Design a protein around this ligand. Structure first.
Ligand SMILES: Nc1nc2c(ncn2[C@@H]2O[C@H](COP(=O)(O)OP(=O)(O)NP(=O)(O)O)[C@@H](O)[C@H]2O)c(=O)[nH]1
Ligand SMILES: Nc1nc2c(ncn2[C@@H]2O[C@H](COP(=O)(O)OP(=O)(O)NP(=O)(O)O)[C@@H](O)[C@H]2O)c(=O)[nH]1
Ligand SMILES: [Mg+2]
Ligand SMILES: [Mg+2]
Ligand SMILES: [Mg+2]
Ligand SMILES: [Mg+2]
Lengths: 346, 179, 179, 346
């Protein structure tokens, strides 16, 4: 009989710990539970939904159906979800698409709720990852004016970024954010800063900061990590952080600590790279060579030139250029080495 | 004694006191601990107007992680007890978002009793100070009855297992409902 | 044209805009004046899903002093419109104290539509300043839907006769209900 | 046909003005209205209630019945009320009695609501006035802790005090308040001051002040009027009035003006009586005679003596008694002639 019981326990999406207390019950109780499980296998099948979702309903009718599909994906045997499978998902995202071409959000929201339930589990996250528009469509779902759907989508994306199994997941996500941003005339961390703004629900703020951390933590490259921090920091992230630091909220407090400490470490490290460079390239002969090899015929070029050009605005004659560069250098150093360095106003 | 027996399943947010309520009706000792229920069921006996009537009590995990487990309990329910903590507005907000869609999906036309627990916390000094820190206050009766009307429950009773206030009345209504 | 005709009686506190609503549906001019109705009745015509359906509108005095007059109007109602002003919490509070016991007493099992009038005043600058002076604020939608559930109405729609917002929908629901 | 129409208009408790607009309608409309009226003459008869009220129901059952009886007394033809008549009332107050011997107030309250509806009209107020316990029972209904029932009872009593037809109505009422107060170990304007207390609903405060005014306005005798004002004023009414004077409430504002102005006039008048006495009794020969005729063998005596006794505490020898009486006199004058004069702390 204890065979079915394993089968059951697998079908209920429970980790090792969660399963503990079920393993301790008497076989007599385990025997009732296999027969409840065997019986209950309270609505339509997978294919009966998939059809409703194909007959193109609208309004209360769509919601009515999505609310019920939500409860099934959520409360049924993981096996049911697999029957719903690649198809269900593809038509779920089909609806989502066609919906944005109306830009009810109760409907978009419900789909997300479904998706959340679908990804709830190992089978789900796998099938979501193989989809063409899945990630992109979650990203489209971060709308500050529809806060709760932004929260749900945000978390779902945060879980993704932190996945080891498929490489560079954070980057998958970031690309989607990038894409949509080119797709409007808008800055890519715009929706995140917008949700940090004061007078948005604390819940919205938290999960905003959570995604920022989720994008940065798992990254192996220092460069990526100092880079995107500076992008946000440039766009005023420091200032938006200040009035949050006084909210007595256990979660908000945790993300600020992760964020701050990320900063210290990342940038303590960049400084230590400087110490290396200072040994390797101790004169212009080394410097000139790097430029010609590493900047010269790359897309980095025009931006690099433009910097050198700004650094040589002063007349050569000027009786105090030493004093002037000693200064420019402190600025430049701050810009590159302090973690809130790209700030418009330090 | 071919006594009448009805199924009562009880559900609600983790830690809003589903289990203490059950236990206080029966053995009559409040547990100081808090061990989260996965799946448990008791038998009670209760009075209603001249009748001794067995009551089959089905206790459920409140935690999210047990969502695929819970429908094991719903199959032939006669009456639900749906709970929230009075010291927890959030726990209330879950009544229409989560617990209602769920119960109507698995038990359609099963009467529901909306029940506010930990009544004793309403006028609790530490509780209020803590709920303030979050821009909130304890649940008002008024708020609780309005919710029951919204989910179209059989009614609303409030209680505190810790002091045993309003408890005997909780189970009478439920006995009364499953009829 | 042997058209379907249903009786709609409308009631509510003096001056919460029962009459303007009626008149805006029909002639289509908002009266600046305010002459208090004693007893008046109009005929409308309204669409519902392919149908032209006459609607017999019975307008009533909102004032207390006409309480013995009003039951002249109730005899074979098919659907009530029960109103309050959004700029008037007091006018709301009268929904369960006065207007419900009355309507259930004279028209039992007649569907009711709870209707919030003067929606336009909700975000009105002078209104808010004035309601403050009394330790109050305008009616919240949330408050209005909770009330409708409490009196177990057929539903809740809000509107402003002055701007004509939400009006066409008011009478559709009523047409829909009396069926 | 216009005969019935008069009959109808009488049966609906409408004054001359209220009736105006009904008189202006076309006979064709007047003809529908007589036939609605003739038809509707939606529950049980008078005698069917009177029986329910005699079979001694309790709890939800009593309320359920009282709520329905409330709507009838309220919404039916004045004629229906007359059928309910002296009996209905007597059994309504029967319930009320038996209820106080439990000291639900939902029940007591509903009865009051009924009574209000019953007195709503000329027939009603008449029959209420002939009852032994009616007034007394309304008075028992002014409980601050059950505020809304206090309001209803208060108004109902205020309407009474202002009735000309039967003489000295305010006094009828006041006697009832007196009675109950001896009946507890309590001061008779206690419940009124209690309802003026801050943090009771504005509505409660207003109607409290309203009853105070209703007791005092209609009184023909200056004496009564200065008397009971001073009783309240003694018990701190001035102080309780102060924080009310800042409430922006149209009704509360009106009662304060009536109250204040009552004070000025009453007391301007008492002063003018003084001017008379000062002419009539200009020496101790007049004074002594009044005392012996007017105080000596009356219940005023012991209190009068006690005052004279306090006025002659000073030794006769004292080198400054003139200066001392010039002073005592200003105090005594304030006590008797200023409208907030009995104040414990001026
Ligand atoms: N003040 C107060 N605390 C209570 C009351 N009932 C339970 N508690 C406390 O709050 C917690 C709730 O316990 P429990 O009854 O297990 O709740 P539960 O909802 O069954 N838990 P689960 O969701 O995991 O099944 C415990 O720490 C308990 O001691 C009550 O009536 N008043
Ligand atoms: N802002 C605003 N004012 C309105 C609206 N409808 C009516 N009013 C105003 O508020 C008053 C209400 O008028 P009316 O329609 O006669 O109300 P009523 O409830 O029928 N009166 P009665 O109780 O005496 O029958 C009038 O002064 C009117 O101009 C509305 O939609 N918005
Ligand atoms: Mg490190
Ligand atoms: Mg438990
Ligand atoms: Mg009108
Ligand atoms: Mg005068």
């Amino acid at each position: 009989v204890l065979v079915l019981f394993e089968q059951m326990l697998v079908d209920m999406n429970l980790n090792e710990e969660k399963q503990q207390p079920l393993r301790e019950k008497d076989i007599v109780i385990k025997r009732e539970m296999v027969s409840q499980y065997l019986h209950t296998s309270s609505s339509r099948s997978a294919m009966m939904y998939i059809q409703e979702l194909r007959s193109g309903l609208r309004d209360m009718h769509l919601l009515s159906c999505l609310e019920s599909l939500r409860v099934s994906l959520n409360n049924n045997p993981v096996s049911w979800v697999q029957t719903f499978g690649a198809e269900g998902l593809a038509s779920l995202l089909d609806i989502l698409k066609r919906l944005h071409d109306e830009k009810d959000s109760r409907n978009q929201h419900e789909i997300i709720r479904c998706l959340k339930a679908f990804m709830n589990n190992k089978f789900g996250i796998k099938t979501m990852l193989e989809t063409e528009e899945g990630i992109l469509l979650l990203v489209r779902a971060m709308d500050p004016a529809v806060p709760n759907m932004m929260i749900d989508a945000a978390k779902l994306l945060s879980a993704l970024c932190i996945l080891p199994q498929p490489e560079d997941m954070n980057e998958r996500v970031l690309e989607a954010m990038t894409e949509r941003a080119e797709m409007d005339e808008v800055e890519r961390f715009q929706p995140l800063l917008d949700g940090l703004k004061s007078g948005t629900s604390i819940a919205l703020k938290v999960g905003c900061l959570q995604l920022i951390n989720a994008l940065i933590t798992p990254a192996e490259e220092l460069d990526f990590r100092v880079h995107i921090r500076s992008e946000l920091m440039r766009l005023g992230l420091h200032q938006v952080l200040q009035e949050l630091r006084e909210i007595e909220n256990e979660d908000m407090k945790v993300q600020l600590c992760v964020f701050d400490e990320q900063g210290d470490e990342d940038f303590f490290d960049l400084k230590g790279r400087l110490d290396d460079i200072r040994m390797e390239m101790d004169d212009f002969g080394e410097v000139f060579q790097i430029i010609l090899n590493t900047v010269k015929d790359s897309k980095a070029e025009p931006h690099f030139l433009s910097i050198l050009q700004h650094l040589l605005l002063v007349r050569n004659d000027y009786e105090a250029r030493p004093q002037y560069y000693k200064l420019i250098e402190e600025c430049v150093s701050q810009i590159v080495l302090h973690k809130n360095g790209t700030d418009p106003d330090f | 004694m071919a006594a009448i027996r009805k199924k009562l399943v009880i559900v609600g947010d983790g830690a809003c006191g589903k289990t203490c309520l059950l236990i206080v009706n029966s053995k009559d000792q409040f547990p100081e601990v808090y061990v989260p229920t996965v799946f448990e069921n008791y038998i009670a006996d209760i009075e209603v107007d001249g009748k001794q009537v067995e009551l089959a009590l089905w206790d459920t995990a409140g935690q999210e992680d047990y969502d695929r487990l819970r429908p094991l309990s719903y199959p032939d329910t006669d009456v639900i007890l749906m709970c929230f903590s009075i010291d927890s507005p959030d726990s209330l907000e879950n009544i229409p978002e989560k617990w209602t869609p769920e119960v109507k999906h698995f038990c359609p036309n099963v009467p529901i009793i909306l029940v506010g627990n930990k009544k004793d916390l309403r006028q609790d000094e530490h509780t209020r100070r803590e709920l303030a820190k979050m821009k909130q206050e304890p649940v008002r009766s008024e708020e609780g009855r309005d919710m029951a009307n919204r989910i179209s429950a059989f009614g609303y009773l409030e209680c505190s297992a810790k002091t045993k206030e309003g408890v005997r009345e909780v189970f009478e209504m439920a006995t009364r409902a499953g009829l």
